Amino acid sequence: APESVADFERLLIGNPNSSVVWMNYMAFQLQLSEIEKARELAERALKTINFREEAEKLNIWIAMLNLENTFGTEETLEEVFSRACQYMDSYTIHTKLLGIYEISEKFDKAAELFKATAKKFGGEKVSIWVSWGDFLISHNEEQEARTILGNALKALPKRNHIEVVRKFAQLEFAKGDPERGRSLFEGLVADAPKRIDLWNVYVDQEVKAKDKKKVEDLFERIITKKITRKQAKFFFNKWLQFEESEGDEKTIEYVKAKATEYVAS
Amino acid sequence: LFKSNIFKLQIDELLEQVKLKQKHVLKVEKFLHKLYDILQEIPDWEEKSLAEVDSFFKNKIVSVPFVDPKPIPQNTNYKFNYKKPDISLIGSFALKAGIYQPNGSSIDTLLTMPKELFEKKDFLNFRCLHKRSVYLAYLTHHLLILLKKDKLDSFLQLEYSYFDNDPLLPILRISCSKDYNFYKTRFSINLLIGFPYKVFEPKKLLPNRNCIRILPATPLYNFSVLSSSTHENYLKYLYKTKKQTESFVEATVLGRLWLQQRGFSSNMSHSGSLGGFGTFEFTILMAALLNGGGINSNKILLHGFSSYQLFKGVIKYLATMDLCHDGHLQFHSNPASKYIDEGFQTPTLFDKSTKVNILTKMTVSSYQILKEYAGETLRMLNNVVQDQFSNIFLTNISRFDNLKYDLCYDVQLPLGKYNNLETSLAATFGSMERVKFITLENFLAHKITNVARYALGDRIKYIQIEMVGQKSDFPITKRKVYSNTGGNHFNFDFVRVKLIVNPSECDKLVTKGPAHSETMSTEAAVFKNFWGIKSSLRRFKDGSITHCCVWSTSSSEPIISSIVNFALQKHVSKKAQISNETIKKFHNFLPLPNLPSSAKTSVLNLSSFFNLKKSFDDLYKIIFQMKLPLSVKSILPVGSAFRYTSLCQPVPFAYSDPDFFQDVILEFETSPKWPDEITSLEKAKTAFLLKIQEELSANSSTYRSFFSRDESIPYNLEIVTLNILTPEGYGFKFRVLTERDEILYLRAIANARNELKPELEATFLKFTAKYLASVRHTRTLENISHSYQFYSPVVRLFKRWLDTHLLLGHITDELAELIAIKPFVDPAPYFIPGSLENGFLKVLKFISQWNWKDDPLILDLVKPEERLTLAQYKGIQMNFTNLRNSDPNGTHLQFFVASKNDPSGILYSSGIPLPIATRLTALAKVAVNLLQTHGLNQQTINLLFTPGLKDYDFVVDLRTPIGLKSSCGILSAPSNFPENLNDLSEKMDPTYQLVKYLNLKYKNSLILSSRKYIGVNGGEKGDKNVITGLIKPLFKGAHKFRVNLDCNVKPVDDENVILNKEAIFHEIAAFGNDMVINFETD
RNA sequence: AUUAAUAGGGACGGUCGGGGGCAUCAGUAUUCAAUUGUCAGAGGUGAAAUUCUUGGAUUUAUUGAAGACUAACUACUGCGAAAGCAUUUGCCAAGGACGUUUUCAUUAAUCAAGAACGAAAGUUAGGGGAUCGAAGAUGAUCAGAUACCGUCGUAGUCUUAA
Predict the structure, then answer these.
(1) Given an 8 Å threshold on Cβ–Cβ distance, is B305 in contact with A34?
(2) Would B714 disulfide with which of A59, B150, B763, B1067, CB 3.0-4.6 Å?
(3) Domain with CATH 3.30.70.3020 in chain B
(4) A170 CB inside 7 Å of strand C
(5) Cα-atom radius of gyration of chain A, to the nearest Å?
(6) CA-CA distance, B798 to B841, in Å (whole number)?
(7) CB atoms near residue A192 (< 10 Å)
(8) Three-state SS for B387?
(9) Helices (H), B699-828
(10) What's the Å distance between residue A135 CA and nucleotide C140 C1'?
């Protein structure tokens, strides 16, 4: 491997757009207890790489920040932050910083990183709200994610309402309160019972919680909703799929009798 | 890239300094060919029991070096024999790591034992170790017959030894005394015997498993058992690790260079010393660093990296990755290294394939002591300004016990014989206590280190109990290391306790403990037993309750000086007496201040100095808000009492000390209406201080008032100093300052011609250091002493050691304080200064090798981790090389003492004569050389304050009318002033102004130096002094007819004039006729 | 060396713009929450209805949190390739007009093909849902990846009026 001062520098003449060499060089420079040659390396790879490569350029600011996460300073990681906020996007380095502070064991600044990015990218983007949702319920703060989710309904337009309120449900069904996640599915299906895009993602997740009492109840009532033939026969195919996995073939037997009689009209 | 390449040129040349030639290794390996041939004819005898072994060797020359416990026939069932062993190479010469050293080294020629001669039960009851102690004397019995037959024994000798200073494996040593002649190479051949690789069970020979069943965990006994098998496989790792790294041996050479500087090597440290991890473990750690090192086996050091990367990263891993109380290191020789984050209360470097601890040789006392130097040495690889290659290895750090440590005491261990230890020590020493620590040199070594651990605790930085007089050698015709030294039967003469103390807790009186409760808690059980009647119930300031002990404060010793005698009295030895007689008389050379609890004031007690700062603040409190025509904006003193630089501690009503009035520099509002004349400048500012005196005379009758002119400014005779003495007894010399002071000085330089420009520039430096740069140094004087208050205990006494030798009359106190503050900001390669004995001995060695021509002084006024940058400190280097153009030998510019505020170097050290500076270094050369040659004793300790005053054409002995030691505030007092304040100066030093006129008139022919502090430097009366004076070199030859020779000379002919000493002796005699007592004329 | 298209690039310096990207600070106006005084109405309408209301609707005032924009000044005002564009100030790069006995001498004009900027827009229920396929369920990947690798399949993709 490249393990010398002359080794990784020679590869820069052959590979100018490769920040992966400087990603191992900063691991090779600061391993010798002198990170000033590693802070020089992330500064050098910015002016050596091609400007058309955005995968290594944004990662270069993510490299000097993650090096700053354990081995940096207070205002040095922030002066590199507002330099990446001018040369690149703001919240995408902050959603990288929210994942970095999730690993950095600084929950207080990550609480500040969730709020300071909520002023910029809370009103227009529905993306980081679920990122605050998964981080809250993993720390067992279930009502805290539910508090700003109503703020996330007051954050963006009516198009992001069906997107974000669905995203809180599967985040809670994974690691939070799935009864209020299914109540979000009970809310999104009572908001629009003619839109099967919320009930099917519920029926995929209710049959991912493996409750045949919960899944087949939402399966039996969806066929009696405003659904066509393709949402009648293929939703029965999800019913025969769920009855196969459980262990009672009686419900697998009459599921073909419930769908074929409903088409007999 | 300049931190590596300038280090690599300092690494590649330094490895060439110790360059071992191929000629020395030639006859050393050819003598091994005479060793391998003669051992190849060493035959095997028959198998015999333990009883037959003592029958054959008691009448023979060879004797078995049996370790404790020796074998007994009532417990010996197996047999013993000698065999033809498989000899091999291991160590430095097998990895090509050897180099030229003057003291010499040992060549580890390993002899592997035969596997069939050891049973399956060889690991327990010391069975295989009974084979190794018998076969090593047997192989020495066969080789001495073979080496005598080859007639090489005339300069070759055989004796007993131990491998790595561990007594559990008896071994022989071969050397050369003054074809096979290796006496020119000075390499010794260590005939080491090791066992076969895992001939016993390595899983059963781990640290937690025991091999003395009669069990408790035997970590050290299994360390000598299991590592006897790893001599071949671990060496095979470093054989191939040398081929994968181009600078494995070069960085382990710098690792061998750095570890030898602080006393770390392959010598054992459990026996009461410092060591256990040296060149053997660092090259092993360089194999673990070049094969991973992360917490999940990630990389720590590179394979293709050079010596600049492998040397710094491993010691930083020795500093930042803990191995003693927080974690442990893993290794595998048979696959990466992955550091274990669980500790075992000692150093534990895990060999996962060999089941032995590679850091087992170092105890807890020697583990953390190397880490404080590791972070110190790794910080030197982090600095981007100073050169750090000489600071690592080329500066010996292990010379004196008073140098690298704060205090070392001689506690004699008259413990006697082993069976009489039931009445010698308070400890119960049996067979089970001697299971893992079987050697008696190790048993009290960690016990007294643990008994001192409850005694000092956080008051020090480490613990080092040193076994002075303990060797490792024995005769092969003798049993082991036996001696009748010190009245005892131990493997030492005595023991010495060494530690580097932290000054914020080293003299604490309230010995803190755990909290009290309803029942005696387990944490409170140990502290109550350790103190007993000394433990009592004492509450806190905020309301907390805990069991604590109050200690006794003294002006000659710290609080730990009693506890080192206390904790050694109870549980170490009832007859042992610990005493530190070096730092006891060292504190007696300082002035004893006349205040309450003066003998009860420790060296850290600085309450008397800050109490004088309260009165001056109360003095400035009446000054600052007062209404005058010109308002005040600056009220600050630049005196030596507020900067802790006064030789006398500030006592009230003290009129006789020269540092009584702390100097004051004050400033008014910005004013263009100040006059632009020098005589009119001090005529106006004294008028605003006249109304300020008129405001102090009107409604401030508690403070007194008097005026005096300060003649310390050359060519300025219009200045006036305001002397205000408060009601408590502290006086200040108040002088104003404006923007017209440096205006009149710089206009005096440019307007004057090329003739008189120099003296008005030096008198401008008299106005610079007293008015312009006065408060700038006074701000950083009190500031950076908060990191090391021992500088204030040393630099007040380092001038007191300088004032006793007639040096105060030519140098200022600021350049004397910055000399003793060089080992505070730059203490390399020693520890942090923490005592007056440590501070004075650091200044004694540093001022010895202080060559004033080649290297100047640039000390950073920065606290512990404000300093000048790399571009700024190089600008300070530009002041040296340009001034040395017309002053190359230090005759016109000797002491270049510079800092961040004054990089000119000549702030307080310009205008001084070079010949007194030559004796200032000579008194630093002879005083430090006397410490290492004749030892350090109180005959020599007070001798540094004893000047002989030789090389003198003039030596004047005098005695004053009133002895003024008690009047200066020195308790061998001051209570009130007189009714008229003019009579207060009648008890001052009369030789201060008598010698002030001496250098004034006769400067061109006489070199006048004298003492300014006659109260402490007078002895009993506090009024005695002596002045050493030498004639100039230019006025030592005949000087022709001129007018401006400025020499008190006589007629020698009709053409030449010479300074006749007859009128020259009487001229200083007719002035001081009342003080005329004695005068030496040569 | 035939001239330096009162063609053109390029260069200097004085200007200027609601130009755009980023940042700065300032401004009123709105919602929601904490909460006091008090209610027979409050909102809406041509008249009503509807809506919340001794659950204090409603008015005033205060604090917190969040989102939008620069009224009067302010206009046939300039600018931006067009689309578009208004607090104070900057950074970076772009631009109308300017003068050179500044530099080059046609480097210059229209653009198929082919590419870059970019004005509006995603709501109700009916059918179809063959294909695709977000939502999600998924086996691998990297240290880590809700992405790139493989699949089923919901809304939709096709159409019907508001």
Answers:
(1) no
(2) B763
(3) 401-509+553-579
(4) yes
(5) 25
(6) 10
(7) 13
(8) coil
(9) 741-751, 759-767, 774-783, 791-798, 800-803, 813-820, 822-825
(10) 26
Q: Which two tokens stand for residue B231?
A: 């001599």
Residue with tokens 């153009």: B885
B964 near B987, Cβ under 8 Å?
yes
Task: Name the nearest CA neighbour of B82 among B133, B21, B158, B125.
Answer: B133
Beta bridge partners of B1078: B957
Query: Residues of A with CB below 8 A from B321's CB?
Result: none
Which tokens sit at A216?
Answer: 């087949």
CATH number of B401-509+553-579: 3.30.70.3020
Among B304, B320, B381, beta carbon nearest to A3: B304
Do A4 and B305 make contact, defined as CB atoms within 8 angstroms?
Answer: yes
CA distances from B833 to B377, B394, B496, B900 (A): 17, 21, 20, 22
Residues across chain A: 265
Extract the tokens encoding B654: 């003290």
Angle at B15 between CA B11 and CA B19, to 5 degrees: 165
Tokens of B657: 């000390």
Q: How far apart are the first and last CA of chain B?
A: 62
Residue ranges in B84-210 assigned as alpha helix (H): 127-149
Of B303, B313, B384, the CB nearest to A3: B303
**B265 and B275 Cβ atoms separated by less than 8 Å:** yes
**DSSP strand pairing (B857-858 vs B706-708):** unpaired
Strand C footprint nucleotides (protein C-beta < 7 Å)? 22-23, 66-68, 122-130, 134-138, 146, 153-156
How does DSSP classify residue B125?
A: T
Instruction: Please state at what angle helix A36-48 crosses helix A19-29, rounded to 10 degrees.
Output: 170
Domain with CATH 3.30.70.3030 in chain B: 950-1082
Q: What single string gives the DSSP state of each residue in A156-172?
A: S-TTTHHHHHHHHHHHH
User: What span, in angstroms and rounded, lies between the C-alpha atoms of B531 and B534?
Assistant: 5
- Parts of chain B belonging to CATH 1.10.1410.10: 1-19+195-204+245-400
**Could you tell me where the DSSP H helices lie in B602-677?**
607-624
Give backbone dihedrals phi and psi of B860, rounded to 5 degrees, phi first: -85, 125
Answer whether B480's CB lies under 8 Å from B171's CB. Answer: no
**Hey, is the C-beta of B381 within 8 angstroms of any chain A C-beta?**
yes
Indicate yes or no: strand C within 7 A of the C-beta of A221.
no
Q: Does B905 touch chain A (CB under 8 A)?
A: no
ω into residue A193 within 30 of 0, thus cis? no
CA distance A203 to B757: 99
Span B950-1082 CATH architecture: 2-Layer Sandwich (3.30)
| Discontinuities after residues in chain A (C–N over 2.5 A) | none
Helix (H, G, I), strand (E, B) or coil at B79: strand
Q: Which helix (H) or strand (E) holds B725?
A: strand B721-725
| B301/A34 CB distance under 8 A | no
Instruction: Select from B395, B452, B480, B469 the least CA-distant residue to B166.
Output: B480
Rounded distance, CA B794 to CA B514, Å? 35
Angle, helices A142-153/A161-175, rounded to nearest 10 degrees: 170
Q: Which amino acid is at B46?
A: E
Which of A83, A89, A177 is CA-nearest to residue A127?
Answer: A89
Contact between chains at B306 and A4 (C-beta distance less than 8 A): yes
Query: Could you tell me the distance in Å between the CA of residue A119 and the C1' of nucleotide C70?
Result: 21
Helix (H) or strand (E) holding B1030: strand B1024-1031
Structural contact between residues B116 and B63, judged by C-beta atoms closer than 8 angstroms? no
Rounded Cα gap, residues B861 and A77, in angstroms: 29
Structure-token pair, residue B1003 = 């400067």
Tell me, which fold does domain B1-19+195-204+245-400 have in CATH?
Answer: Poly(a)-polymerase, middle domain (1.10.1410)
